[PDB]
Amino acid sequence: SSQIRQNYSTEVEAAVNRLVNLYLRASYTYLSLGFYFDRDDVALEGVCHFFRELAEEKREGAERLLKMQNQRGGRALFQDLQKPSQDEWGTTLDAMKAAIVLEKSLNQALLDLHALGSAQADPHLCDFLESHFLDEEVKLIKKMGDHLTNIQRLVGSQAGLGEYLFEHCTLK
Amino acid sequence: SSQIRQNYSTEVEAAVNRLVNLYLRASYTYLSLGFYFDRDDVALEGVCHFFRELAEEKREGAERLLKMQNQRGGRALFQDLQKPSQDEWGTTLDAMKAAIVLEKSLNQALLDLHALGSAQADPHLCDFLESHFLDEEVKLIKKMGDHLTNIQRLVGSQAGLGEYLFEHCTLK
Amino acid sequence: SSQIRQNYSTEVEAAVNRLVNLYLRASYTYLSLGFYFDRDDVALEGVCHFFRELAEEKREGAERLLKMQNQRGGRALFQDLQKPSQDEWGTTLDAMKAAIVLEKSLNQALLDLHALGSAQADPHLCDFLESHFLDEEVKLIKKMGDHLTNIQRLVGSQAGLGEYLFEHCTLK
Amino acid sequence: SSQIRQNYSTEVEAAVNRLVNLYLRASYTYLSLGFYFDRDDVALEGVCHFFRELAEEKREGAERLLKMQNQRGGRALFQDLQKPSQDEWGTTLDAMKAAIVLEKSLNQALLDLHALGSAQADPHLCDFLESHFLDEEVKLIKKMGDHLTNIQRLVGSQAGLGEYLFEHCTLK
Amino acid sequence: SSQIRQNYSTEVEAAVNRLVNLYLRASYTYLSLGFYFDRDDVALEGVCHFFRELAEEKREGAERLLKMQNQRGGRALFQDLQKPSQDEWGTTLDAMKAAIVLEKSLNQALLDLHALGSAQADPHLCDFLESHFLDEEVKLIKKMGDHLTNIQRLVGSQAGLGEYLFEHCTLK
Amino acid sequence: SSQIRQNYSTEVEAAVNRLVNLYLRASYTYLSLGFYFDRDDVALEGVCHFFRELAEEKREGAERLLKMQNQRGGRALFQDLQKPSQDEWGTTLDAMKAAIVLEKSLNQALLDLHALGSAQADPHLCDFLESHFLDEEVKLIKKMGDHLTNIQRLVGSQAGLGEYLFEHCTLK
Numbered sequence A, B, C, D, E, F: 001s002s003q004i005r006q007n008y009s010t011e012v013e014a015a016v017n018r019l020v021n022l023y024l025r026a027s028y029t030y031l032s033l034g035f036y037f038d039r040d041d042v043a044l045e046g047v048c049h050f051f052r053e054l055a056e057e058k059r060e061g062a063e064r065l066l067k068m069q070n071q072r073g074g075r076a077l078f079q080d081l082q083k084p085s086q087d088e089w090g091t092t093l094d095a096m097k098a099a100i101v102l103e104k105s106l107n108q109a110l111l112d113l114h115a116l117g118s119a120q121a122d123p124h125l126c127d128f129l130e131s132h133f134l135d136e137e138v139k140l141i142k143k144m145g146d147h148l149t150n151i152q153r154l155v156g157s158q159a160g161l162g163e164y165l166f167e168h169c170t171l172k
Ligand SMILES: [Au+]
Pocket: A117, A118, A121, A122, A123, A124, A126
């Protein structure tokens, strides 16, 4: 029986705890992605850094959700964090494809929780997601889509490689 | 068949991966401890901060182990991260008692892995633990022991409270 | 047969060497006091620091006496330094009571050596003690007396605790 | 009959002198590698610089061993420095493969001397190697392994070239 | 029954307390050496300063051992500090010879305690000695050996004096 | 068949490679000289530094010759570096006498290679030696000659010692 809780449904409280788990799982996935690219037999430092930075972003997302949970008088509950879906992550392309799948899953969970807060007439929750998460996900998915296009361009062809280099070295 | 691996036994490689899991589990435990103390019905911000800072230290420990794993040509393998042993953590005293138990478990795992690296004649591993982990654990356990003593002093008695305050307010 | 010695009696020379021993013994006592309060099961850092600072002051006193011994053409002679009277020092109150006893012993030895230098018509020695030691001891004994009063106030009672806090937190 | 020598076996003294020779030989090898890449018909300035910097590192390693030899009261003895194994060093790939072989040889000699100092109960020697040499070798071998992977990627294929460029030009 | 003590044998605890006594005794010896050289009939200020600086180093060594004792949950125990072996210390040469004997005794006690911590599988203790004491002793013994050589050179002969002066006044 | 080589005889190319060997051998000799003077039973730090600085100068000379070899389109070839002529180097005087012998040998090799480049009508080589090596050797041999004179003065006599000191301490 919380002294602060107001207009905060048990349904949202539970879904927030699930979303925390999903974000921490995503962080874990990215930690694994990051260290795979740091292997001596893989050795793509920029790819390693890109994923390790995402591990930190997803951890921060979970912590913001947990802070919000307490701000509303809900109770943080933590579950098993499942290990990432793969032990080795293939090429940059394979990894960036797995990343964009992961981000779309998070984005859909965000959208689901928003629809829940809408249905529960919880405008604080709706604003919280909109202001801290929904655009962050859109921007990130756009960037990953950009990357997948450039990765494919570069691995694909003479014409692709040349277009990339002209953009990178002349239009710089 | 790694191009860099030299004097790095499969036994150590595996134990390093287990130790990563233990550190990440400890980080998770501390995240849970931290957010428990941020609850409105608990509200000890300094205790929250103490534990959240430890969550970050234990995460950093795991990342240093993972970096080292790749430096030696071993292969990082990640497992399920089990949820913390409790959902609610009681008083500051209960929490600090659970923390020192956790730290002793980590310290013993460190000591076990050191004895393994000794037995495997792996001086790089031995030096790595000594230089980055063994003293950090001793210092932290000493600080927690200090804390448990002061917590007990303060909750215990008139005489205890007064000794604490004289130290804190006059000998300042 | 010293080329510099003038108006410096063998009685004073010997008493200076004894006083050096007493100061070094006091330093030793305070080193022991300091480290007792740094124990994890004692853990009063401010008390530890107060005593370790006194260990250094008493060492400096001995060195000033030794410098003076050579300035007058006397010969420094060192004896066994007896271990402190206790291995464990009890409460802050017990320790501060033992400290003020120790300081009074030093102060009386100073006063005795002054009376000796008076009787020997040795105004340099008399001035040396007055200017470097006698007021230092008075100031320190006053501070310790202040402390004993506040320690007793704080451990003693509700009324005592409250008077202390008002002084410390409002009249600040 | 040295006035300083303590706990320093003739076996270690001799092995230190051998290790000095090995380091100076490695320096010589790298000098040769460096100047090969500065030839007008080779002309890879970055490769030249990479090897000349290693020549200087290996020289510094020998000088640190020689300083330590005198610190322990051993006697530096110098032998013929054999010329490098090749007069011409092939491609960047051939050269980086020869470099990592050389580094593994040094690393194994370090490990052998550590095992010797262990067997001789010479903790100063063990600490010296650990603190100045063992991690330096691990880090360097990891970097060379990284390089071999990227060299092979780049010389190998369209897909390899593109992965490298995306890492280098976009994830920059 | 200490709340922090882990992997810290009674044998090491006791030997640490003995080593503290040895360091404090060495400090005492150096205090005596220092003041002997400040006598008007000796008057070698640089020699006085060299020894008084060593008195302070050996005191600091004891305090570091005592801090470590508490960090591990051991209990500092202090004994009688025996007076130095001599009341007068002869020439610079005699004094520097007594100093290097003293340092070798400390170094051997360090090595003995290291072998003990090895036998007790106490890697924290081993690392502590290696990182704070073993190299400090080697460096100091090397410097004293250097000094003994130069002292003997200078007191010995015309040729010795001239070699010293050329080094000091021209190669400066 | 070099694309840059012009007016660069095989005779000069070979002699340059020999001169590189001689310079590196001289560097090696000086490394040995330097560390001999750092022995605790020798302990002339200024003499050690003088020789170690020369080791670095002779290494730099070899590298400048190697750079020049490639600039002209010749091919660097390295041979065995023979160990120095002595393992122990005697007094400062003995060492400075061996140094000036070594320098005269280098100077004569320089002069021989200059006469060769003259005979081959190779003005670039002639200018290179003149501008980077011939005066450096003259200046160094003059300084060593100065030193030998002062060493002999100082070890020799009362009158010699006094002349040196007046120059050093008054005319300063
Ligand atoms: Au809403």
